[PDB]
Amino acid sequence: RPYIKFIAAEDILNWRERWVNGAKRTTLLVFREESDADDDGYQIYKEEVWR
Amino acid sequence: DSNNIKYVREDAKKMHKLWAHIRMAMEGSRAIKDNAKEFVPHPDNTKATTPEGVARYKAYIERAVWYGASANTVDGMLGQIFARDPVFTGPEDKFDMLINDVDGSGLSIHQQARDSAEDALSLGRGGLFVDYSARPYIKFIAAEDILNWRERWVNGAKRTTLLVFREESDADDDGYQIYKEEVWRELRLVDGTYWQRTWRENDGQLYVDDWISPTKADGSQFDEIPFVIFGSKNNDPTIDMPPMRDLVELNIAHFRNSADYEEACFICGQPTLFLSGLTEHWVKNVLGGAVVIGSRDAVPLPVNAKPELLQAEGNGMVKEAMDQKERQMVALGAKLIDSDKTQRTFGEASMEAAAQNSVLSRVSKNVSDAYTKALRWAAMFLGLDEKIEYELNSDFDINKMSPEELAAVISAWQSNAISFTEMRWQIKKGGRAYLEDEDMRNESEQDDPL
Amino acid sequence: KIQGLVRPRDPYSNADVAAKDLRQLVDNTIKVASGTPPINIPPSMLRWIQKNP
Known part of the structure; x- marks a missing residue:
């Protein structure tokens, strides 16, 4: 199924706008996603994912 | 790996x-004065080290008056949220066990809803757990009891994998004493499959139970943990900031300024004679170490002896600070106090009522859909109807229905515009009828008396 | 407790009797504080053998 994420403002960190055939096309957009670690222990880490 | 289960997460320790x-x-002056070190700094710590300093601080604190506006604000918020009763949608005779005694203690679902809404309005967190014994039992877990939650992507979606909370019991011994035996529940979600394990301690022994996967009536186990962390903002594991923080801070500031004001009132609130231009000769001979101040007796004084009563004048800057903090709390749009002196021209507050009850319209929705999700989990435990809901009172500032209101509702039902059950819910909400709809239908089936 | 709470009497006579007071024995409950010696649990040793800290 599709998922509709929500990216906080500080996470959106790069983008571009190139005029292609007289149109504004966003050629690039890079944002951050942040999660924990599934160590078998109960300790919590911080992992990073860049989409 | 049977790891540290009493591990409380760093953000939880941060928020404690x-x-x-x-x-x-919330508990009021009894607790505030008891823990006065955290709230009211000592006026002079150098003296405070000395025993006369601690005696002075005890006198300074005991004279203080805690305003108690946070308790009234919370109480008022719940009053608007819980008027008449929350509405249950779906089958009712097939769900009566979750309604009459929600957790097998005779406590109704609406009273647990009241407790949960209060706890979410006060410190902005909560929890509802669903477990299968037969009958499903809805739990209520305080903000301070949830001590671990792990979130990752399972199939590329924000999923809750680990969740540990605390359970507290009182051992059934032969005597009458009370003990607090403690239970830890570990909820795990591996590879899209729910799991549950139990930890308990008693008589100096930590026990671990086998992993179990509670299954629905039709089977296929569970795909998500039956636990919602309802808060001020949303039902996400991340801590939602407590909505009551600002009002507390203002009330603490008002409390310490009240302490200052009361010290001033006790010391310099009484008039004093301040007999200037007086000699010990005059005192010891004619005054004799005593003065009669009443109207019946007249006291003489020597030349250039000016008497003048001194007392601290009113409207001091401490009192204006106190009044400003009372007004600041009112400005913070908090229902802590009601002023009869102030007046309102009607029709104005109708615009702001939307913003006045934002927190209410938000916590009500959060608690409502959290309870709806919990009831859907219970239904999947019993394979009952899954398209059921639970809604709180979304219409605050409730009041009795006027004759025009009642007549308009009747006419709106005589037209095919409002449902009959909706009409009855209107009339009950406005406090104009009390019996159930079906009992009324049965009473109105018979021919009219005439 | 009142030790001499019941005393004989002579209804035919009128003699003096001494008064008795109410004492209040007080109980007690001491507090004992215990603790744990410091334990060195560096994560280095646990991680060197693949055990979570």
Whole structure:
């Protein structure tokens, strides 16, 4: 199924706008996603994912 | 790996301080004065080290008056949220066990809803757990009891994998004493499959139980943990900031300024004679170490002896600070106090009522859909109807229905515009009828008396 | 407790009797504080053998 994420403002960190055939096309957009670690222990880490 | 289950997460430890302070503010002056070190700094710590300093601080604190506006604000918020009763949608005779005694203690679902809404309005967190014994039991887990939650992507979606909370019991011994035996529940979600394990301690022994996967009536186990962390903002594991923080801070400031004001009132609130231009000769001979001040007796004084009564004048800057903090709390749009002196021209507050009850319209929705999700989990335990809901009172500032209101509702039902059950819910909400709809239908089936 | 709470009497006579007071024995409950010696649990040793800290 599709998922509709929500990216906080500080996470959106790069983008571009190139005029292609007289149109504004966003050629690039890079944002951050942040999660924990599934160590078998109960300790919590911080992992990073860049989409 | 049977790891540290009493491990409390770092953000939970971070929030415990504010949670405890909010709790003491709710319990009122009894707790605030008891823990006065955290709230009211000592006027002079150098003296405070000395025993006369601690005696002075005890006198300074005992004279203080805690305003108790946080308790009234919370109480008022719940009053608007819980008027008449929350509405249950779906089958009712097939769900009566979750309604009459929600957790097998004779406590109705609406009273647990009241407790949960209060706990979410006070410190902005909560929890509802669903477990299968037969009958499903809805739990209520305080903000301070949830101590671990792990979130990752399972199939590329924000999923809750680990969740540990605390359970507290009182051992059934032969005597009458009370003990607090403690239970830890570990909820795990591996590879899209729910799991549950139990930890308990008693008589100096930590026990571990086998992993179990509670299954629905039709089977296929469970795909998500039956636990919602309902808060001020949303039902996400991340801590939602307590909505009561600002009001508490203002009330603490008002409390310490009240301490200052009361010290001033006790010391310099009584007039004093201040007999200037007086000699010990005059005192010891004619005054004789005593003065009669009443109207019946007249006291003489020597030349250039000016008497003048001194007392601290009113409207001091401490009192204006106190009044400003009372007004600041009112400005913070908090239902802590009601002023009869102030007046309102009607029709104005109708615009702001939307913003006045934002927190209410938000916590009500959060608690409502959290309870709806929990009831859907219970239904999947019993394979009952899954398209059921639970809604709180979304219409605040309730009041009795006027004759025009009642007549308009009747006419709106005589037209095919409002449902009959909706009409009856209107009339009950406005306090104009009390019996159930079906009992009324049965009473109105018979021919009219005439 | 009042030790001499019941005393004989002679209804035919009128003699003096001494008064008795109410004492209040007080109980007690001491507090004992215990603790744990410091334990060195560096994560280095646990991680060197693949055990979570």
